[PDB]
Design a protein around this ligand. Structure first.
Ligand SMILES: Cc1cc(CNCCS(=O)(=O)O)ccc1F
Length: 658
């Protein structure tokens, strides 16, 4: 159907615009849709874009509004004091402000559906909330409504929630348009989605993006596909990948690089209320924090990620146990059998499960997928599914049998409850992945594994050397391979931090010279340098001119292929803020070839200083553009948990940055 009202080119300059005459007598029936294309690149702290109110004395709480905050939050209020209704629905981190320094046209669609008693908001083609109520309040059924307003709400004759921005286009319909019809509304998005709710992963949430440009020109991305809300492990999380063959313009349907099947892959709307938002899938194995590198010699792609057995994360991982036993100068994975109080088994050569108490081998073996076989026969466990049907999280058997894996809660044989690092490879540039293998311990039997630094590994340009950074208490632990990742050694680099999440990413400044940039607890990004391809490392220095919070955020970095202002250039991606994960920037640094110091010369604002920006991935695309895949929200804030479609991708050119 066509609109009952349509208007545009409204400038909101801290002065409301009255459209009562045009709109109020057009409103009819109990269902409505608002479609609004608007810009706000310098919003007030809290502002209303659109309002329908009773402006009379004594009815200040009788109004409908669409409002936004300078945090990027969008929402509505639907209020009628006589009816005793005060609805407030909203979602943080739903908006764009600026892109390439120009104000972004956001497309907002609000559907008020009396038949289904549901209010649904979309912004930029993304559903940010859908709320069903027992007692529906039609937006123009508010008692005594007498004003329709742009850029404020008229309460008792005065302008509340005054806005700064513009509404280029606004249409209203006397119908609740379908989700199908919404999908046909043209958008002006500055961004793309690679991974998204409803795709092949069936994860409703994503975190920890990576990007890496392959020698063929294919661009590969990996990510945490997070099922139980956006929580770090313990949860259910798989590692998923997607690639682009056209410089980032389009992306393949995701596949899994690493996955467990003890729990179903379920698209769940995780509760965001204060009572339930910390609900956590507590019995599932999971992966977390992936990193990618390409090996020139073999041509293989290599992906590592942390691995957690059922119920396990950072919080509860057995520190002081690697989960391996040394026997002869070799490391074997330890196992505990159903009913034992200790770990009396090891996985020796050829997956053979071996009893340590009696040095006797068993009739159990572990196959390549870490699955348990008895006498060559595949053992199984029943899968779990999760739901909130009861008002709290339940994890229960779903009737389906899956291969028994030693990382599972229901397995006859279990690994040590600690964190491991797994490796997989692809021989077809991400079209499929091999079954993962655990990496051996690097810091000894009685040390839990290090934590992988998410993002990219480093393939030195002049050799076959591959490096993945990892971190642990007191050091960075670089993992080095010269044989296509068949064998690894460590190179330890002391840092003056205990228990830091020292997520580190590397650039090769020139042949053999590596600078690593890393997250700290000091509010500054740190760096160190190797001049011998990672064998030894300098002391730690800090970057001035960029601020992070006390807790820090992952930083991504690349060495750009082209000179800028006649100099070798490095580009860093990070929030720039001492307050929260917001104020995203790409910072272009020029290398002083006299001493390899870096002059951080250009700061490019990804979006508003107040809009969210957390973990990120950057890559130089084959056409010399820059691709950025990043968490567009504050992934620390306890107010912005469990948001869908906030990991987003943009394309930039160097002239945009400088
Ligand atoms: C549970 C767990 C957590 C980490 C660290 N992730 C930190 C993410 S954030 O800084 O809190 O957003 C790394 C590995 C792991 F298994």
């Amino acid at each position: 159907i066509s609109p009952i009202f349509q208007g545009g080119s409204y400038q909101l300059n801290n002065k409301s615009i009255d459209i009562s005459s045009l709109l109020l007598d057009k409103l009819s029936g109990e269902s409505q849709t608002v479609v609004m294309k608007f810009k706000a690149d310098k919003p007030n702290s809290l502002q209303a874009l659109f309002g329908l109110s009773n402006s009379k004395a004594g009815f200040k709480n009788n109004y409908f509004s669409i409002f936004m905050r300078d945090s990027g939050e969008i929402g509505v209020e639907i209020r009628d004091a006589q009816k005793g209704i005060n609805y407030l629905f909203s979602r943080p981190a739903s908006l764009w402000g600026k892109h390439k320094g120009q104000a972004v046209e956001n497309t907002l669609v609000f559907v008020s559906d009396s038949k289904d008693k549901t209010y649904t908001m979309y912004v930029n083609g993304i559903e940010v909330f859908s709320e069903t109520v027992d007692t529906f309040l039609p937006i123009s059924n508010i008692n005594g409504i007498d004003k329709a307003t742009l850029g404020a709400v008229n309460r008792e004759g005065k302008e509340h929630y005054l806005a700064k921005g513009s509404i280029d286009e606004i249409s209203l319909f006397n119908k609740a348009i379908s989700d199908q019809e919404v999908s046909t509304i043209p958008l002006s998005n500055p961004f793309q989605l690679i991974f998204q709710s409803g795709d092949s992963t069936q994860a409703n949430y994503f975190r920890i993006p990576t990007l890496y440009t392959l020698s063929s020109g294919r661009v590969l991305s990996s990510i945490d596909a997070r099922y139980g809300g956006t929580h770090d492990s313990k949860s259910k999380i798989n590692i998923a990948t997607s690639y682009s063959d056209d410089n980032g313009k389009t992306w393949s349907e995701p596949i899994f690089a690493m996955k467990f099947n003890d729990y179903e892959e379920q698209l769940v709307y995780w509760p965001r209320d204060n009572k339930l938002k910390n609900s956590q899938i507590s019995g599932s194995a999971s992966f977390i924090d992936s990193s990618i590198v390409e090996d020139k010699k073999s041509g293989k792609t290599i992906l590592l990620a942390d691995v957690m057995p059922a119920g396990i994360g950072n919080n509860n991982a057995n520190k002081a146990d690697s989960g391996f036993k040394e026997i002869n100068g070799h490391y074997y994975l330890k196992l505990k059998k159903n009913g034992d109080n200790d770990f009396r088994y090891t996985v020796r050569e050829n997956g053979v499960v071996y009893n340590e108490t009696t040095n006797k081998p068993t009739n159990y073996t572990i196959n390549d997928k870490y699955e348990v076989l008895e006498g060559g026969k595949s053992l199984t466990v029943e899968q779990y599914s999760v739901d909130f049907d009861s008002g709290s999280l339940r994890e229960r058997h779903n009737g389906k049998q899956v291969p028994m894996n030693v990382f599972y809660k229901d397995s006859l044989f279990k690994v040590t409850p600690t964190n491991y690092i797994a490796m997989t490879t692809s021989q077809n540039r991400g079209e499929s992945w091999e079954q993962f293998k655990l990496l051996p311990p690097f810091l000894g039997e009685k040390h839990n594994g290090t934590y992988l630094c998410p993002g990219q590994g480093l393939a030195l340009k002049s050799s076959n050397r591959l490096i993945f950074a990892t971190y642990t208490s007191g050091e960075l632990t670089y993992l080095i391979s010269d044989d296509s990742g068949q064998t690894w050694k460590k190179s330890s680099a002391s840092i003056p931090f205990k228990n830091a999440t020292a997520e580190a990413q590397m650039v090769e400044l020139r042949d053999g010279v590596i600078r690593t940039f890393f997250r700290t607890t000091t509010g500054k990004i740190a760096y160190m340098t190797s001049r011998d391809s990672g064998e030894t490392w300098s002391k730690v220095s800090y970057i001035d001119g960029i601020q992070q919070t006390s807790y820090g955020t992952q930083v991504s970095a690349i060495k750009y292929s082209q000179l800028i202002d006649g100099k070798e250039a490095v580009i860093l991606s990070t929030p720039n803020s001492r307050s929260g994960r917001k104020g995203g920037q790409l910072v272009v640094g020029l290398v002083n070839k006299e001493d390899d110091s870096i002059d951080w010369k250009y700061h490019y604002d990804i979006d508003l200083p107040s809009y969210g920006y957390a973990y990120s991935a950057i890559t130089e695309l084959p056409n010399h553009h820059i691709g950025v895949l990043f968490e567009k929200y504050d992934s620390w804030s306890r107010n912005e948990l469990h948001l869908s479609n906030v990991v987003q991708y943009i394309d930039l050119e160097i002239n945009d940055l400088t």
